[PDB]
Each structure stands twice: as C-alpha cells, then as structure tokens.
Amino acid sequence: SNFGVDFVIHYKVPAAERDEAEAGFVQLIRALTTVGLATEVRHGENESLLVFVKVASPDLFAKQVYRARLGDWLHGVRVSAQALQDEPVVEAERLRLIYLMITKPHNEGGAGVTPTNAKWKHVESIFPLHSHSFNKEWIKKWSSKYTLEQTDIDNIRDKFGESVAFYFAFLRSYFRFLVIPSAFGFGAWLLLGQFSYLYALLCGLWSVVFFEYWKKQEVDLAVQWGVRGVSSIQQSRPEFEWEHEAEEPVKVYPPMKRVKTQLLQIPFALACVVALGALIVTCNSLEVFINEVLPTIFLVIGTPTISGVLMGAAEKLNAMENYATVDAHDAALIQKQFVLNFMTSYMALFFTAFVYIPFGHILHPFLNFWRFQINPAAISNQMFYFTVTAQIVNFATEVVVPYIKQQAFQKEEAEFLQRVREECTLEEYDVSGDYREMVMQFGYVAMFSVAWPLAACCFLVNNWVELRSDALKIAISSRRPIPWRTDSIGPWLTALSFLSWLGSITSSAIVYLCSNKAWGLLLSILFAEHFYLVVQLAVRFVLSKLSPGLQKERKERFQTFWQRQRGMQETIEIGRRMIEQQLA
Amino acid sequence: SNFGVDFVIHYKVPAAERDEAEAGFVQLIRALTTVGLATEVRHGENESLLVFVKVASPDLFAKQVYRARLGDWLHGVRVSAQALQDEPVVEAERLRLIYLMITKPHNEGGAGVTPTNAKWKHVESIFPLHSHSFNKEWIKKWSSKYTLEQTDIDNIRDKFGESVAFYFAFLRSYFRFLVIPSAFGFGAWLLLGQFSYLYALLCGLWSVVFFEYWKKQEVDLAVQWGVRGVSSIQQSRPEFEWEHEAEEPVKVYPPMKRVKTQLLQIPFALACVVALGALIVTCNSLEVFINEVLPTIFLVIGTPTISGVLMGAAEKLNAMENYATVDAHDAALIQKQFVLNFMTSYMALFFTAFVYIPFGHILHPFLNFWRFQINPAAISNQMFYFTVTAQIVNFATEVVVPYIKQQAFQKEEAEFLQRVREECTLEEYDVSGDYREMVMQFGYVAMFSVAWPLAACCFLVNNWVELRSDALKIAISSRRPIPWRTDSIGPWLTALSFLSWLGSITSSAIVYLCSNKAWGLLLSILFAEHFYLVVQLAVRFVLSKLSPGLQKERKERFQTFWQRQRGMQETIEIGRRMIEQQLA
Ligand SMILES: [Ca+2]
Ligand SMILES: [Ca+2]
Ligand SMILES: [Ca+2]
Ligand SMILES: [Ca+2]
C-alpha cells in the first residue's frame, strides 16, 4: 500500500543543464518549504529524481480547508477550527486542496510551482498515487453485478473526484435508457419491415425524453454533492500570456489578435472537409467499380491514424490561440474535437444516403476513369458494416492493444519504488475521449438507426462492456487523474441537442428517399421537425412539474375634518346617526 | 388637494339588511382599530357610507416597513428603527403596505377585511385617492415633449407603482423600435414594389432584435428598481376555496376537479371558432356577391360587442375554475384573453390570405345561394381597410366616448367630498387591456405588414398618441390602481415569441402565394423558418456579451523512509549526492 505519500513530482534532470536544473531543484525544495509539506527525494529511472510530498502539520491543512470553504461559501457554492469533524473530509477534496496549495500563486496562500511558465521548466508531471487494494475491490465488485446503484457512483465521487463520477453517472443513465430504442428496433425489425416513419418518430421522442431526463438528473446530482454553481467560478490559466496590464489588476489580451487567430480555423475546416470528401468519394468509386466487374472496411480500419493527426493539429491550433480561462479553453478544444469527429465519422453515411441514393449519375466520371443502377437497400447493409466493425476495432485499440504495448515495454522498500517508477510512465487519463465516443454513439442511434433498426440493440451490449472496460482503463492503463470539480458534463449538452435535432431532420428524409417528388420530401421533413419541436415543448412542460434539491433549498431558506371625530365610540354613534337619517 | 387620506372604503348599506349590514359596520370599525389606522365616516350618495383611513402612529408603520423589508430580504428580493431615513420611502410602496395591513389576515400582522369571502360582503371597493396637481403637471409635461426620458418613467414608478411603470417603459421601447419597420416599409413601398421577400426577412430580423433587446432592458429595469425576483413570491388568493386541509398547514384542492373544469375550455373554443368562422365566411360571401352584381367595415364596427360578450364569458369561466394563487389565475385569464382576441382579430385576414387566394372555388355554394375569378392584389387593399378603420374606432371608444358618457352621467369641505363621491363611481384601471392591444399591434406588424408595407408607419403615429392617450385614461377616466410589484410584464413574452414565430412562417407564404407548385411554397416556408431560428440564435449569442446590474451584483458580492531525512539541508545534500552520482 501507499506510504502516506500524497503527491509525487518527477523533475527530470538532463545532464545538459546540470547546473541550471540543480539550481531549480534548490528553488523547488524551498517552494515546498513555506507551505508546510514534507518532502523526500528518491531515485528515478531515465535520469529523473522523484520527490514525494505530503501535508505534515494538521493546523495548516485545517486553515487551508477553512479558507477554501469560506471561498466557496462566498460564491454561493455552499448554502449552509473543529469544522473538519463536523463535515467529514474526503480523499478527492483533500487531494485537490493539496494540489491547489502546490500550484496556487504566492499572493493567494499557495506557492505556485506550475511546470510551464516559470523557471522550473524541468518539472513535467505532478500526480497522486493509485490504491491497488481499492482498485482490485472495485473491479471485482463491478464485474459481478448486473447493475450499479447510487452507492457505487458515490464511492467513485469520493475517491476519484467529481468529473469521473459525472461521466460514470451519465454512462449509466445512457445505458439504462438505451433499452427502449433496442426493444423498439427489435419490434420494427421483426414485423414492421424496413424504413418505417413510426420508428423515426419514436426515436425522436426517445432522444428528447432522454436529454431532458438527463438534464434533470444532472441538476439533482449537482445539488446533492454540494457542487451546484462551481461553473460560475473562473480559474486563471497559468499558460495565459499578456501584453498590456490594466486595472484588482487583471491581465488583458488584445481581442483583435484572438479573432485573427480564430479566423485561421476556417481554412483548416475547408481543407479537412475537402480532403476527407475526396477520400470517401474515391473509396466509394473503387467499391462501385469492384461491384461492376472491402474498401469501406479498409477505410474504417485506417481512419484512426488520420483522426489522430488531425486531433494533434487541432490541439496545437488551440494552444496557439491564447485563452485566459480554463473553461473557455476546454470549451474551444471540445468544439474542435466534436467538429472533426462528426465529419470523420458521419460523412461516409451522409454521402451514401443523400448522394448515391437520390441521383447516382454524378460519379460517372470516376467510374469511367476506373474503367449501372443505384441500390436503395444498400445503405442498410452498409450501416451494419459500419457498426459491428467499429465495435470490434474500438474494443481492440482501447483494451487489448494498450495491454500488449505495456507488456512489451515492461519486458527493503524497493517494491514501492519500482511500483511508482512503473506508474510514472503512464499517460494522464483524459475524460473527454469517453464523452466524445458516447456522444458519437448517441448520434448514430439518433440519425442512422432507422436504416438498421437492430443497431441500437448492439450498442446496448457494448455499453454494458464499456461501463466496466473504461473502469479497467483507469485501474491499470492510466495514472490517477487530478480531482477537479464540475457542475455538469459541460458543453456536451449543446452537442447532444444539435445531434438530436439533426436526427429528427435526417431520419424522415432517409425514410422517404429509401422508400421510393420534392414536395413530398419537403413536407415530410417539415412535419418531422415540427413534431420534434412540439414534443420538446411538451416534455419540458411536463418535467417542469416534477426535485428534492429545491425542497431542501426551500427548507433551508425557511429555517434561516380631523378633530371633530377623535374617539371611536363617537365615530360609531355618528355612524348610527347617519344610518338612521338616510332612511328619510 | 387631499386631506391626508390614504384609503377610502365605500361599504354600501342597502336597507334590506339594515341590521345585518350595520353589525358588519361595527365589526369593520373594530377591524381597523387594532392595526392603528384612524377612521372617519362621511356621507356617500347612492345610500353608501364612505370611510377614510390613514396611518396615525409612525411607530407601527415603521415596524410594518421593517417587517416587509425583512420579508423581501429573506426571499432574495433585496441583496443589501431609523432605516426609513436611510432608504427613503415612496408613495407607491407606502400605499401598498397600508393596503396589505388592511387586507392581510390576522396571523400575519394584518387584519384581513377582504371584501369577498368573509361576513363583510357589503364592502366592494377599496381605493386610494388621486392627486389633481400632479396629474395636471404630468399631462402638461408629457404633452409638450418629443420624447420621454428615464426620469419620467421613474416618476411614474414612484407615484403609480411598478406595473404601470413597466407598461409605460414597454410602450416607449416599442414606439422607439417601431421607427425601423416604418422606414423599411416606406423604402419597400417607394421603389421595391409589392410582396418582396427581402421585406419579410427584414421584418423577421427586426422582431427578433426587438424581443431580445426588450428582454435585456426589462432585466436591467427590474434590477435597478430592486424588484428582481418578486415573481418567485407566491400570494394567496382570498377567494380560493378548499375542501380538504392538510399539512405549515396549506389548503389543498383536488386536482381532478380542476382538470374537469379545465376540459370545459375545449367546447368553448370550438363553439367560438365555428361561430366566428361562419360569420366571416358569410360576410365575405356577401361582399363577393355585391362585387359580382362595406360588409367588412360593418364587421369591423360590430365586432367589439361580440368581443366583450366572449370576454365576460371567459372571465366567468376563469372565476368558476378555482385557482389558489394570484399569478396562476392572472396567467390563465391572460391566456384566454389572448386566444380569443387572436382569433377575433386575425381570422378574417387568415381566410382572405390562405383560402380566397389559393383556391377560391370552395365558396361557390355561398355565391350560388346568394344568386368569377380571385384577385391576388385584394388582400393588400383589404389590409388597409382593416388598419385605418380600426385606428379610428379604437381611438373613438377609448377616448371620446367615455368622456361623453361621463359628461352625460354628471349632467365647508363639500368640495372634497363631492370630488371623492364623483371619483368613487369610476371603474378600476386594468393594465391587461393595453398590453393586449399593443401585442395585437405587434402581431399585425409581424405577420401582415408585407402585404401593405406602409402599415407600420401608421402604427408609429398611433403609438405617439397612445403614450399620451393612455395617460389621460388614468388621469380622469379611471381610479388610482393599487400599486403592486411585478418583476416583468408577465406571460406576454410567450405571446410575443409565438407571434414572431408565426409571422416568420406566414409572411413568406403570403409573399409566395400572392406573387403568383407546392414544392416552392414548402421550400420558401422552410427557408424562412430556419433563417428565423438562426437569427434568433445569433442575436441571443451577441446580446449575451453586452449589463450594469450584474456589475453591481458582483461589486456587492466582492465587497461582502520518513525518519532518514528529517531536516532540509540534509535533503539538499543528499540531492546533490544523487546529482553527482547519476553521471556515472
Ligand atoms: Ca468502446
Ligand atoms: Ca470508452
Ligand atoms: Ca388606441
Ligand atoms: Ca391603450
């Protein structure tokens, strides 16, 4: 088990700047002195020098806890020095506070030793330590239950922080709500036939209901954990660069440079879409030529490399575009990720459904250069070849291939030191990737399940694996993430709403086109869109009348002409006089 | 001027229950004793008995003011016994507090003498008194200025309360924003011709911009006056009836009876729409028969009576349907008013545009019974005959006819008594009617100005009269309204949004139909609707980055393994040893 270590710093020391780096080390050992953290130094392979830090004096930690509590109470996060026993401390919050003490600048109670901007550029990783016993128990418990109750998600929140807990709760809710589309698709595939308008309407209604119920559940969860409104607190980015400083004093960046850098996005998107469209058109032309006298499978198996290259390019562009706050930078990065992944994972199906189907006479030059009728039922089978194959490769590159890579690389207190040395080489866990994968799966169900009604069922099975598989990816395949606080899942709500709307637009058009005049198609699209809007309004209105959080908040709030009538017998007597005399 | 009188109670005493009513009078003179209000009794014509009440002891009034301030601070209305000088008192708030003291029940600090449910059913009117000097000065000032600055609206808020001030601010903003549609319509009428798509798009954009800017301005105004969030405070309705009482104890009404009464609305709406449709169809058939070998003018001049009858029926139905809170009852009444007025004022134009234009062969039996081609340009001129005529009759029945009626009815301290006796016979001022009229005018501009582009200009002129004329209607033609507090204009925002959306749908369809295939019309409608949605999103996003209220709120918030290394020189020395020995 752990030796009480709370944080580990790598601090690689290359021989090139042996003096300078050494000086930095001295500064580092001073920067951790004033805060009150005990530091020990140990050998680290690959010419590194692992330092272990942990809080020693309980008084300083209690003062920091009280300061953080007051800070969050001031901003409205909390509605309610022996308070530590009154509200029990948890591992996630304690680790977050220690990390803040390590990272926060001087003028805010901390000693900022962030590894990016200051002189100590040798530091590159600050991570907590894993718990093997808890990981083994967690895996064993989750692999032997049919479902996960709220207690397991609460334990995840207690240990690994709030972001991981929110992701797991969202995945569980999505998996439990995916049952209805699966049953509906099985019913439509067994008797209804193919390309049914009823299935499209039911899918739209299910998407609306799931989205609204998830919003309500996330509000309730945020209220329950006492992290309601943390999104309103801004956290400054250490890497933010400033040119002019104005007045509390806050650094200001000229917005013109930001807009100038932002406009570089449009050529990037145009080049990406042109190249990918050329690739998919060439692949489809080759497939059609082969049919006339596998390429889709080759494209599906070869797209991850191009996706990774574009992802690296997008992250570099986001880094170049200066951002002052963490939330804005994360939102911009998420938007770029979603756009690229949407294009890459949807353009093939869009071309198959809305180009090859309605008029297949436009790719004639491609066939002629390679050297005929269009199949309305092609897309259906193609959709299958897009689902199952993916469900295989996504299960390969995310589970077994990393294990094989780790096995290949791998092949008195030395046990703990060896364990931490092996742990320090892993990559930091990112929660955005799982969110993106789940959102893309939801989009598949939303706007392409009508072609192949059984598809949802397959996804359901995959979800039951993912809820465990991702857990394994955190157990052994990644280092412990830094516990942060998040009110909600973030900008993914906008992505889900956009995908639902696009699905409502697309499913009816696909049904009308594959079942067979422009007026009929336009009428079908209009009716589907307006039905979606009406269902959205009705579901919002119904769910507005259902939440214990507001009850608790209300309970807390509740718990927390003059002188002629001077007397009054005289007034009554004169009133009686008027009452008597009005009878005349 | 006034004799210091703060409130007047009529308390008509018919000779039928001379004893019983008299007993009630005694009870009344006791109910106003405990609170601390001086009561005087004076003769009232039509066998009535006017009582004047005013607060005498400053200590009780100060205590009530402090209690109200604490109550609103507890609910979040206020973010910030000599406090009266610290925050100056105003006539509107003082009158509201006195009215609450008169009306609030026993267990809440008041002495509830509401004139509806209790034994004192003889009471029928409690009203404040007008100020002739202030009214004359206000009329003279407003009739000699080209525009009204924020100071005049602030004075209105100080004197007549918050509801009237909000209505006047909304009317001023609407009048100032109506300039752009007028210029656009003049430009389109001078050179562009008739039935232009560009004008429809510009009208949609203007409606979106005006709605969003009004929302922002109303948020700012609510923050400035310190009445932000008063909508969240529920006020119990004295007329509410209960059957079973549960547990603080609150009365509960069986929702099944409420739904049973609510379902009576559908037959009412069906009967109203059928009767009105038959009427308009008959009028149009008569007009067409006369053309083949004025009726619209007769319909326009005769609709107010039917409108009033239906309005009385709707108010009776709303009274029958029991409601527990004031806001819900007001919202339901407003919804019924809007539905009825929308139908009555729009069905004629809808029938002319979407029935007579696309296929005029369906009313053939009507013409045959009375005993041919349709005119595409008819609706335009018809729209004119619907605007100007209305602008006349609405200016007649609302300004001059009430003055004539009052003149016909009319023809040591007796002057003040005579003035109050004449004042007590007027009807209570209602602010919903002006809101409904303005909303209907906005709907006219939104979805029927493309047929007659000049129409907006005419409306502009009318607005400049209304901003004064309505003021006159409060000066002499109505009694002083009870000053209440409102956060926003209320449910009229939903009506404005619905009217804007319907206008975006309707204007493009009218353009396409009157300019001449179903596919073209459907494409035009779809493009117009989606352009409206995109413009709405863009305007919301832009206006989200513009407000001194949040700055003030932020300013207020801001203002408010272990033992082997014990020392630290030893740690640095051992670190040096590692640095030296890693070179080998
Ligand atoms: Ca997976
Ligand atoms: Ca995953
Ligand atoms: Ca008028
Ligand atoms: Ca008016």
For B290-337, what is the HEC assignment? Answer: HHHCCHHHHHHHHHHHHHHHHHHHHHHHHHHCCCCEHHHHHHHHHHHH
Q: Give the method used.
A: cryo-EM
Asked whether residue B99 is domain-assigned, the answer is yes
B72 is in an annotated binding site: no
Dist CA A353 CA A513 (whole Å): 8
Q: What letter represents residue B273's amino acid?
A: V
Q: Do A583 and B15 touch (CB under 8 A)?
A: yes
Dist CA A500 CA A508 (whole Å): 13
- Greatest Cα pair distance, chain B, in angstroms, is 119
Q: What letter represents residue A8's amino acid?
A: V
Dist CA B202 CA A96 (whole Å): 53
B544 and B418 together in one domain: yes
Asked whether residue A540 is domain-assigned, the answer is yes
Dist CA A126 CA A63 (whole Å): 23
Task: Tell me which DSSP letter residue A251 carries.
Answer: E
Dist CA A488 CA A228 (whole Å): 9
Q: Which residues pair with B299 in a beta bridge?
A: none
Name residues whose C-beta falls within 8 Å of residue B432's C-beta, 6 or more positions apart in sequence.
B333, B334, B337
Dist CA A277 CA A283 (whole Å): 10
Q: What is the dihedral of CA A385, A391, A396, A400, to 10 degrees?
A: -150
Count of Cβ atoms closer than 10 Å to residue B419 Cβ: 14
Q: Among positive and negative, which fits the CA dihedral B111, B116, B119, B125?
A: positive
Inter-axis angle of helices B326-351 and B265-292, nearest 10:
20
Dist CA B373 CA B394 (whole Å): 34
Count of Cβ atoms closer than 10 Å to residue B308 Cβ: 10
Asked whether residue A578 is domain-assigned, the answer is no
What values do phi and psi take at A428, rounded to 5? -65, 140
Dist CA A253 CA B231 (whole Å): 40
A425 and A513 together in one domain: yes
Dist CA B398 CA B381 (whole Å): 26
B80 and B144 together in one domain: no
Q: Do A413 and B561 touch (CB under 8 A)?
A: yes
**CA-wise closest residue to A522 among B500, B532, B527, B505:** B527
Dist CA A398 CA A395 (whole Å): 6
Count of Cβ atoms closer than 10 Å to residue A240 Cβ: 15
Token duo for residue A470: 């991702």
Distance from the alpha carbon of residue A391 to the mean position of ligand 1, in angstroms: 7
A361 and A423 together in one domain: yes
Count of Cβ atoms closer than 10 Å to residue B255 Cβ: 9
Listed in sequence order, the DSSP H helices in B411-491 are 414-423, 432-448, 455-475
Task: Tell me which DSSP letter residue B10 carries.
Answer: -
A525 contacts in chain B (CB < 8 Å): 526
Q: What letter represents residue B144's amino acid?
A: S
Are A221 and A166 contacting, i.e. CB atoms less than 8 angstroms apart? yes
**CA-wise closest residue to B213 among B183, B174, B185:** B174
Residue A48 CA to its chain's centroid (Å) = 33
Q: Which residues pair with B41 in a beta bridge?
A: B51
A457-462 long-range CB contacts below 8 Å, 24 or more apart? A457/A182, A457/A185, A457/A186, A458/A387, A458/A388, A458/A391, A459/A178, A459/A182, A459/A387, A460/A175, A460/A178, A460/A179, A460/A182, A462/A391, A462/A395
Dist CA B163 CA B489 (whole Å): 8
Dist CA B198 CA B556 (whole Å): 47
Token duo for residue A274: 């042109």
B181 and B83 together in one domain: no
Q: Which residues pair with A37 in a beta bridge?
A: A55
Q: Give the H or E element holding residue A162.
A: helix A162-177
Nearest to B522 among A519, A561, A576 (CB): A519
Token duo for residue A99: 């990390």
Nearest to A43 among B13, B572, B578 (CB): B578
Q: Which residues pair with A51 in a beta bridge?
A: A9, A41
Are A36 and A56 contacting, i.e. CB atoms less than 8 angstroms apart? yes
A122 and A146 together in one domain: no
Dist CA B202 CA B180 (whole Å): 10
Per DSSP, the three-state class of A486 is coil
Per DSSP, the three-state class of B410 is helix
Dist CA A132 CA A139 (whole Å): 11
Dist CA B228 CA B486 (whole Å): 9
A238 and A100 together in one domain: no
Listed in sequence order, the DSSP H helices in B15-123 are 18-31, 58-74, 83-86, 91-103
Token duo for residue A329: 């930078």
Are A129 and A480 contacting, i.e. CB atoms less than 8 angstroms apart? yes
Count of Cβ atoms closer than 10 Å to residue B316 Cβ: 10
Measured in angstroms, the resolution is 3.6
Dist CA A575 CA A483 (whole Å): 78
Asked whether residue A572 is domain-assigned, the answer is no
B200 and B94 together in one domain: no
Dist CA B180 CA B460 (whole Å): 10
A40 is in an annotated binding site: no
Q: Which residue of A has its CA nearest to B37?
A: A568
What values do phi and psi take at A117, rounded to 5? -95, -35
Task: Tell me which DSSP letter residue A487 carries.
Answer: S
Distance from the alpha carbon of residue B402 to the mean position of ligand 3, in angstroms: 13
**CA-wise closest residue to B134 among B475, B570, B501:** B475
Q: Give the H or E element holding residue B287.
A: helix B265-292
Dist CA B96 CA B91 (whole Å): 8
What values do phi and psi take at B11, rounded to 5? 55, 65
User: Using CB atoms within 10 A of its CB, is residue B200 exposed (0-12), middle (13-18) or buried (19+)?
Assistant: buried
Q: What letter represents residue B560's amino acid?
A: T
Q: Give the H or E element holding residue A338.
A: helix A326-351
Dist CA B478 CA B125 (whole Å): 13
**CA-wise closest residue to B392 among B478, B468, B456, B300:** B300
Dist CA B90 CA B70 (whole Å): 17
Q: Which of B129, B160, B182 is the last residue of a domain?
A: B129
Task: Tell me which DSSP letter residue B427 carries.
Answer: P
Per DSSP, the three-state class of A50 is strand
Are B216 and B546 contacting, i.e. CB atoms less than 8 angstroms apart? yes
Q: What is the dihedral of CA A107, A111, A114, A120, to 10 degrees?
A: 120
Inter-axis angle of helices A432-448 and A197-224, nearest 10:
150
Dist CA B170 CA B179 (whole Å): 15
Dist CA A527 CA A533 (whole Å): 10
Dist CA A137 CA A160 (whole Å): 15
Cα(first)–Cα(last) distance of chain A, in Å?
105
Task: Tell me which DSSP letter residue A357 carries.
Answer: T
A522 contacts in chain B (CB < 8 Å): 519, 522-523, 526
Name residues whose C-beta falls within 8 Å of residue A51's C-beta, 6 or more positions apart in sequence.
A8, A9, A11, A28, A39, A40, A41, A42
Name residues whose C-beta falls within 8 Å of residue A169's C-beta, 6 or more positions apart in sequence.
A153, A217, A218, A221
Asked whether residue A2 is domain-assigned, the answer is no
Inter-axis angle of helices B197-224 and B548-559, nearest 10:
30
Q: What is the dihedral of CA A17, A19, A20, A25, to 10 degrees?
A: 110
Interface of A to B at Cβ within 8 Å reads 3-4, 13, 15, 18, 22, 25-26, 29, 33, 39-41, 43, 47, 49, 74-75, 413, 517-519, 522-523, 525-526, 557, 560-562, 565, 568, 571-572, 574-576, 578-579, 582-583
Token duo for residue A549: 């959080």
B40 contacts in chain A (CB < 8 Å): 561-562, 565, 571
* HSE-up (13 A, CA, CB side) for residue B265: 19
Cα(first)–Cα(last) distance of chain B, in Å?
105
Interface probe, candidates A2, A561, A574, chain B, greatest B C-beta count within 10 A: A561
B29 and B161 together in one domain: no
Q: Give percent helix, percent strand, percent coil of chain B, each to the nearest 5.
A: 65, 5, 25
**CA-wise closest residue to A448 among A374, A376, A386:** A386
Q: Give the H or E element holding residue B127.
A: strand B126-127
B422 is in an annotated binding site: no
CB pairs under 8 A between A and B: 93
A466 is in an annotated binding site: yes
Q: Give the H or E element holding residue B351.
A: helix B326-351
**CA-wise closest residue to B96 among B157, B28, B30, B169:** B157
Per DSSP, the three-state class of A252 is strand
Interface probe, candidates B12, B122, B519, chain A, greatest A C-beta count within 10 A: B519
Residue reference for tokens 């009329």? B139
Count of Cβ atoms closer than 10 Å to residue A215 Cβ: 16
Task: Tell me which DSSP letter residue A16 carries.
Answer: G
Q: Give the H or E element holding residue A444.
A: helix A432-448
Q: What letter represents residue B337's amino acid?
A: Q
Q: Which of A129, A145, A176 is the last residue of a domain?
A: A129
Are B224 and B549 contacting, i.e. CB atoms less than 8 angstroms apart? yes
Token duo for residue A370: 């390679």
Token duo for residue B185: 């319509």
Are A322 and A341 contacting, i.e. CB atoms less than 8 angstroms apart? no
* HSE-up (13 A, CA, CB side) for residue A493: 13
Residues followed by a gap in chain B, C→N > 2.5 Å: 80, 247, 293, 371, 411, 516, 546, 560
Interface probe, candidates B568, B574, B577, chain A, greatest A C-beta count within 10 A: B568
**∠ CA B150-B156-B157 to the nearest 5 degrees?**
90
Task: Tell me which DSSP letter residue A107 carries.
Answer: G
B148 and B118 together in one domain: no
Asked whether residue B584 is domain-assigned, the answer is no
Task: Tell me which DSSP letter residue B15 carries.
Answer: G
Q: Which domain holds residue A119?
A: 7-129
Are A127 and A7 contacting, i.e. CB atoms less than 8 angstroms apart? yes
| Cα distances (angstroms) measured from residue A203 to each of A500, A523, A526 | 9, 19, 17
Are A170 and A489 contacting, i.e. CB atoms less than 8 angstroms apart? yes
Asked whether residue A251 is domain-assigned, the answer is yes
Distance from the alpha carbon of residue B436 to the mean position of ligand 3, in angstroms: 11
Dist CA A181 CA A225 (whole Å): 31
Q: Give the H or E element holding residue B54.
A: strand B48-55
Name residues whose C-beta falls within 8 Å of residue A150's C-beta, 6 or more positions apart in sequence.
none
Q: What letter represents residue A373's amino acid?
A: Q
Are B509 and B521 contacting, i.e. CB atoms less than 8 angstroms apart? yes
Q: Do A522 and B522 touch (CB under 8 A)?
A: yes
Dist CA A324 CA A500 (whole Å): 32
What values do phi and psi take at B251, rounded to 5? -70, 140
Q: Give the H or E element holding residue B52.
A: strand B48-55
Are A272 and A343 contacting, i.e. CB atoms less than 8 angstroms apart? yes
Q: Which of A102, A129, A156 is the last residue of a domain?
A: A129
B394 and B419 together in one domain: yes
**CA-wise closest residue to A432 among A571, A335, A288:** A335
Dist CA A251 CA B129 (whole Å): 58
Per DSSP, the three-state class of B393 is helix
Per DSSP, the three-state class of B42 is strand
Residue B92 CA to its chain's centroid (Å) = 19
Dist CA B46 CA A182 (whole Å): 76
Asked whether residue B193 is domain-assigned, the answer is yes
Q: Do B39 and A571 touch (CB under 8 A)?
A: yes
Q: Do B33 and A568 touch (CB under 8 A)?
A: yes
B299 and B260 together in one domain: yes
Task: Tell me which DSSP letter residue B480 carries.
Answer: P
| Cα distances (angstroms) measured from residue B160 to each of B137, B143, B234 | 15, 19, 22
Dist CA A331 CA A493 (whole Å): 12
Q: Do A29 and B582 touch (CB under 8 A)?
A: no
What values do phi and psi take at A41, rounded to 5? -120, 140
Calculate how close chain B gets to A27, using CA atoms only, in Å: 10
Calculate how close chain B gets to A234, using CA atoms only, in Å: 13
Q: What letter represents residue B15's amino acid?
A: A
Give the pairing of strands B48-55 and B37-44: antiparallel
Token duo for residue A493: 């709500």
How many domains does the structure of chain B reveal? 2
Q: Give the H or E element holding residue A245.
A: strand A244-246
**CA-wise closest residue to B221 among B489, B507, B34:** B489
